[PDB]
Structures are given as structure tokens and as C-alpha cells.
């Protein structure tokens, strides 16, 4: 990885929300995979700033490949994760597991 995208992580009452700052990179080209309890944000961003670098009077934007991985709490419900993107921001919505309902197990014969 050559650049680290900035990320906020929020805890609402029933979900966690992860926000990432990935501008100029199409959502269809963002690999957000959830595997073995670990949420991974992957892809690469290419700015026209090396294929025609000598024409650039001024470089500041960060470019290259990225790969952030985040450990989910055991209250996260990985099979319900949803993600969406708008104006270059990645929102990942991470539902929380439902609270275990307290039973009394009756005994069969």
C-alpha cells in the first residue's frame, strides 16, 4: 500500500458505520470484502499524474493502491453488512447482532 485513506468509525445503537474518503474512484472498483470476521477495504486509485507527469505544474493529490482492514466486534452481524457510495465517500453499514432472548428450556422425555 502507498496511501492510507482516512476513515471514521461510528457506533449507533444498532449498527456500526464506517466512513472512508475515496475520491475519484468508482464504487464498482472498490473491493470491500468481509471474511473470517474481518472487514477489508481494497482497491487502487490512479491519477493522471505519472502517465503525463511533466505537464503538471502542481501535484498534491495522493495516488496508488490501498488496503485497510478492520476487526469487527462480536456484536457485528457480518451477514447483514451493506455499503453505498456518494460524492467520493464510502459508507459501510454494519448491523449489530440481535440480543439473545432469555429463555427457559423445558425438558422433554
Nearest to 39 by CA among 74, 71, 8, 67: 71
Cα 64 to Cα 9, 17, 22, 56, 84: the distances in Å are: 23, 25, 11, 17, 22
Cβ-contact 88, 21 below 8 angstroms: yes
- Domains of the chain in start order, with CATH, are 1-109 (2.60.40.790)
For 46, phi then psi, to 5°, come to: -120, 115
DSSP 92: E
Resolution to one decimal, Å: 2.9
Name the E strands within 46-102.
64-71, 82-86, 89-95
| Structure solved via | X-ray
Amino acid at each position: 500500500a502507498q496511501w492510507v485513506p482516512r476513515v471514521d468509525i461510528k457506533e449507533e445503537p444498532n449498527q456500526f458505520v464506517l466512513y472512508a474518503d475515496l475520491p475519484g474512484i468508482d464504487p464498482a472498483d472498490i473491493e470491500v470484502q468481509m471474511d473470517k470476521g474481518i472487514l477489508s477495504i481494497k482497491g487502487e486509485r490512479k491519477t493522471e499524474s505519472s502517465s503525463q507527469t511533466e505537464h503538471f505544474s502542481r501535484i498534491e493529490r495522493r495516488y496508488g493502491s490501498f488496503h485497510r482492514r478492520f476487526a469487527l466486534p462480536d456484536s457485528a452481524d457480518a451477514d447483514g453488512i451493506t455499503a453505498s457510495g456518494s460524492h467520493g465517500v464510502l459508507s459501510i453499514f454494519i448491523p449489530k447482532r440481535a440480543a439473545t432472548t432469555p429463555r427457559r428450556i423445558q425438558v422433554g422425555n
